[PDB]
Amino acid sequence: EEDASQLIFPKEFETAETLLNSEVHMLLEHRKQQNESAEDEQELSEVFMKTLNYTARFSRFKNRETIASVRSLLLQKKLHKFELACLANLCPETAEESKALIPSLEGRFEDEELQQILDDIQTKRS
Amino acid sequence: NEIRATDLPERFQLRSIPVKGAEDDELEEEADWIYRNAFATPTISLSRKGPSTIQKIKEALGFMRNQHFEVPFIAFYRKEYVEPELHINDLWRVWQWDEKWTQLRIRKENLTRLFEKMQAYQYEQISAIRALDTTDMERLKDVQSMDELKDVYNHFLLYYGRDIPKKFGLTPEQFGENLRDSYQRHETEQFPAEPLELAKDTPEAVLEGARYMVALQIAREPLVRQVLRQTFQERAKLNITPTKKGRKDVDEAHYAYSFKYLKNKPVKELRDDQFLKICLAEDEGLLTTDISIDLKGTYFEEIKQFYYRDEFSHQVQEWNRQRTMAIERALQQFLYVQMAKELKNKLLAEAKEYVIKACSRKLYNWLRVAPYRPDQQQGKGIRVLGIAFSSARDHPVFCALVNGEGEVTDFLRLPHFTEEREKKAQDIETLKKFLLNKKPHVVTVAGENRDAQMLIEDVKRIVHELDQGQQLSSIGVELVDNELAILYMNSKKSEAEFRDYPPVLRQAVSLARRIQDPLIEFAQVCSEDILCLKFHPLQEHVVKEELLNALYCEFINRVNEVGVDVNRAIAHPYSQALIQYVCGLGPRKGTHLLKILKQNNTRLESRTQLVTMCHMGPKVFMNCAGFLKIDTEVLDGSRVHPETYEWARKMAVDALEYDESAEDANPAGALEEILENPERLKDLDLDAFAEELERQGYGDKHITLYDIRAELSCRYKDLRTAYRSPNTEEIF
Amino acid sequence: MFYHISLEHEILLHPRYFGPNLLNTVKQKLFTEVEGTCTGKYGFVIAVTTIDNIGAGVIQPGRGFVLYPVKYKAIVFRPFKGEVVDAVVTQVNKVGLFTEIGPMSCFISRHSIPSEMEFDPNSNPPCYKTMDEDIVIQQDDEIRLKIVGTRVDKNDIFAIGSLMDDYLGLV
RNA sequence: UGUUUUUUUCUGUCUCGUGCC
16 A cells, blocks of 8 residues: 555654755765764774765765755645655656656646746756 | 587587678678787787688688588688697687677677667758767777777767757867877867856856866767777786785785785786786775776876867967866766776786686696506506595595496405504505405505505505505506595596495595596586686686686597597496587587487497488588597598598508508408508608599698598597606695 | 654663763664664664664663663665665666665566567677667666565565656666 | 594372371
8 A cells, every 4th residue: 555656655654854865965974974083983884885875876966055955945835745855856857757757746736837846956956 | 409400510509609600701700800809918829820810710710600610620620721730729719709700790780770770860850069970880880899889889879869759169079089199180169259158158157068068078989988998908007005904904815915015017917917917806806906007197198288279368278278177077077987997897807818718727737638547558448446545544445446447346445544553564454455355457545644645655565565456466556636536426426326335435436537537537527517626716706607618618629639439428337428528519419319329229330320320410420520439430430530531541542552442341451451550651642632632522631631641540549648647746 | 765753762781881981882882773774664774863862761670781762863764665766777687687776676577678678698798778779778877767566574675676667767 | 653432300190188386
């Protein structure tokens, strides 16, 4: 029954806080910077390294202010939290591609209304 | 059915997998590809010269495509068309070169088709920085440039767009030419405009808009890849230097840890020396590796001047700055990284080649069949007394007395040993009783440490002093290293021959077999079995597929040179299953022939047994004519095939000066007299034989005359080495 | 998908750890206990960012061990069905494709892949191309996919991808 | 130029009578 396509999740996960690829990337980078210092400490594990090299290959923007602006210009809408991560991470070109990938956008908003948002997201990319 | 009842042999089909045969026009292309890709970095096949080597490779490829020839079948049967004994890796190298040429041709054809389709799509779209379908022809023509061709094709796909519905700085071609020639023939955009004006005509308000496009164009340009290719791969003084943690973790075990400050290692040390490449790969795996040419700091400076404007007064200065920025962006995108990747790939290839060469050398050294038969040739063979003891410390040591016909006659144990702290007679009495129990022909003792060597020496001394070798003579117990017999004792053959026996008996049997017929043991093992023996530590770093292929080729060549006994693999299990590494007789074909022989009960009547009984096809018989041998026609158990039977008979008659009347069996003076020993060699002239072969036969017999004479004079010639007695260092 | 939620956990502290570094020891124990693990309720956890507070240690009767029900603010990665992400191809095989969704590895079969992407066993690098050879997909490429299934192999998530929906490849 | 050993908590039934603080 758990299918994110139809916007359904358990009660505990419904009250979660979404994270973007750049956000998690910078969080892990800061954690690594803090951990590497303060000698006599247990070093990072393979999980941290794989997550780092996985999120580093999808960092659409390095500036934190870019993350702040792209979340601010998005939260003003009426979309759910789930629509804040996938759409901000994939960064599709045209509205048709976004509507095809995410079935929730089908009929939820107009065409130009989503195309302008996609163009803004593309421009915000570094 | 297709492997055993196929028109072409199994080896020929397996060799030309990507390229199903060679056409008349494609033979020249395959030969050219093989010659070009025969020895680029190291010197290999420089023997055969350049043009002569290319011609020989082309002839071998043509023979393989037409007559379904194979590696040994073309190296021996086509000694004239290929290098006449230039090197061992003649047929296999030719097959590999032909396969590479065919693959390159197929890739070039696919690239040309893709380029034509893209050009047609572009013409249809824009015909109703442009997009022209002119690079497709270049990509299709670039057959030799594999990596460069792929890079150029990928760059073109990323530049034109790759979409399939159903003025900024110097041009890319001009920049590539100026970089390749070393002189900047074309400068940047010599216009009054600067990045301020160019960053407003996209919608970014940043001066780095055109830099990204310039970098993408430079990276995705075949000319840039060609110019950078070979510049650092040809020479790269890789400086080996351990890091902070690699210095202690390596402990001077790898290439990047043995020399604390031993840097400046050129490509010769990594490519030619496979050990250095293996060490660098191992060190670069976990801890770290020191692989840096350190030669760019000066190769990247010269490119900076090219593609940039020379004047500086706004327009000229702005153009020069923009060109420099674009060049830097392109270098950072695919300039240093591409060169480093190419150098790493070249180093890995060199290490793999070195590992394969070491494995092939080890296989050639250890595969030569050099048994120790009676008199170093009563009864056929000698009775090898395989003595494979466990400890020699009051424990039962296996001691089997196998016969010389690939079978074990008997065995026994010797629990008594010098057990007892002070007992110098029990071991002697046990050895005397064991020697008197049977009548072996030779002693094959093993060794593990000083105690084992002392026990072997004591046993040999007791046998020689009391004449325990045969009961009526002293027999020298030949030392045998416990290397092959230990592995063969616990193999499938050892288990099948004896199931309810201790490991000592199996080890003794394996040792006895290894010192009687190494070829039989090598052919009767899985090749799994060959992979158990390590050829060198550097082979582990390189791909094991190349080593396995080299070992299989060496085994096939050895089998072809020594031949196969048809009767030996009919009833004797020890000398059975030896039709897997024959020239043209693959494993499936050999298994089918063995099954047919076991069912119908057909014996090796002559060379045409598989052509008359309907067991093997014409191509299979022709390709495997020089490898199948029988016990009894006269020229069946030799390299003389049916085609050269008449020529061999005529040559023997002329040398013996006997009558000529349909000699196949009936005249024996020319056959039996010449087979017993050399009757007359001056009677048979090389020029006359060659002229006769050319006039009648459709082939020159200048190179095959010697082989035919040897086959007529000596049948079933063995290509294995002699019996190698253990030495001091070798014994240890 | 990565998320930031508030979790709770308790760890017994042996009395030998009492002293001026009690809180530091509790934090150190917490760090090396709830990092990298996985559970079927909240999913796979990456690491811990910060800790909210330290509960009151209730010493057990007749035992020196004391438990601290700490509530930490850590992140979690719990992919669901139907989500679309961008991963990288790790290996190409005739049986199927292998990718790496961060701390998880999925797998797509040839049946899911359309018939246009054929095999290239002749070429040394395993790759899939079309008849015209225009589009090329190989390893170390940012290729998207769709999570059509989930699985947890005893705290080891291993989902399954798919390649039927359009616009799934090179961006 | 040598020196012989390694296995271990078992476990018993239901009923009646007598004596003692």
